[PDB]
Design a protein around this ligand. Structure first.
Ligand SMILES: [Mg+2]
Length: 209
DNA sequence: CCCGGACCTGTGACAAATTGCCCTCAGACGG
DNA sequence: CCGTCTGAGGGCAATTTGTCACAGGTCCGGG
């Protein structure tokens, strides 16, 4: 299946995208890299890739696309918009999109994963976690990395109530660890690092099945 | 000595959002 | 000209995600 690669600057960038938008984003990076910023999406190809109907595919593309407006990207800082013109459909079943050409150098010290690894993940924050572990993966398939909680919150743009740690644990950390273990070929564990009463980092270990 | 207070934890409620499903009907095309 | 495969719309209930009040732990310092 298509091998996604992206600059680490994108893996560690600050943004808030839905699952459907992130799914689309994988195809843009694939299209751009296999070469002005003008990309294209076919309804029927999207449906076959992610096992959706044509109808439900159409709904996902259309609503994802109009939700890009106003979204911004931060590289730690400098902020950019994803799109510089609205999307439009010249033909039935076909969409044309205009990615910000200033984003090109940030797309192409790199991260790589096959698209089948992430296509069953549902929670978008869990897609971001799996991308950040891959950045440190070894050829054989294992790795270990320590991520700071404040940096997790700023990079993944978690909602404000997750600055209370018990909600952070219950609705983000445990769920995203559980999905990865159930939906990817990776087997993931963790332990908490503390300083006084405050929890400051999360330490991730993983191997390949 | 014992307190309220400033921290921390986990859970039960409710509100807001998203999931895969379902149904209708016109466009594009080919045989 | 028409029958079929698409896909652009309109919805749903069942789950998940986002928010906050409340019980219950610790340690410190002033009364
Ligand atoms: Mg959908």
């Amino acid at each position: 299946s298509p091998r996604i690669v992206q600059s680490n600057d994108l893996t560690e960038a600050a943004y808030s995208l839905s699952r459907d938008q992130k799914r689309m984003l994988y195809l843009f990076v694939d299209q751009i890299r296999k070469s002005d910023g003008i990309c294209e999406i076919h309804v029927a190809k999207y449906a076959e890739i992610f096992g959706l109907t044509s109808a439900e595919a159409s709904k996902d593309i259309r609503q994802a696309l109009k939700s890009f407006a106003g979204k911004e990207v931060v590289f730690y800082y400098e902020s950019f918009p994803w799109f510089i013109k609205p999307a439009h459909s010249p033909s039935r079943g076909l969409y044309s999109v205009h990615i910000n050409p200033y984003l090109i150098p940030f797309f192409i010290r790199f991260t790589q994963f096959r698209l089948s690894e992430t296509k069953e993940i549902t929670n978008p924050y869990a897609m971001r976690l799996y991308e950040s572990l891959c950045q440190y993966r070894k050829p054989d398939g294992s790795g270990i990395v320590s991520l700071k909680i404040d940096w997790i919150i700023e990079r993944y743009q978690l909602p404000q109530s997750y600055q209370r740690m018990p909600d952070f644990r219950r609705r983000f950390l445990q769920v995203c660890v559980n999905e990865i273990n159930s939906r990817t070929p990776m087997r993931l564990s963790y332990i908490e690092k503390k300083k006084g009463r405050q929890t400051t980092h999360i330490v991730f270990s993983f191997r390949d099945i």
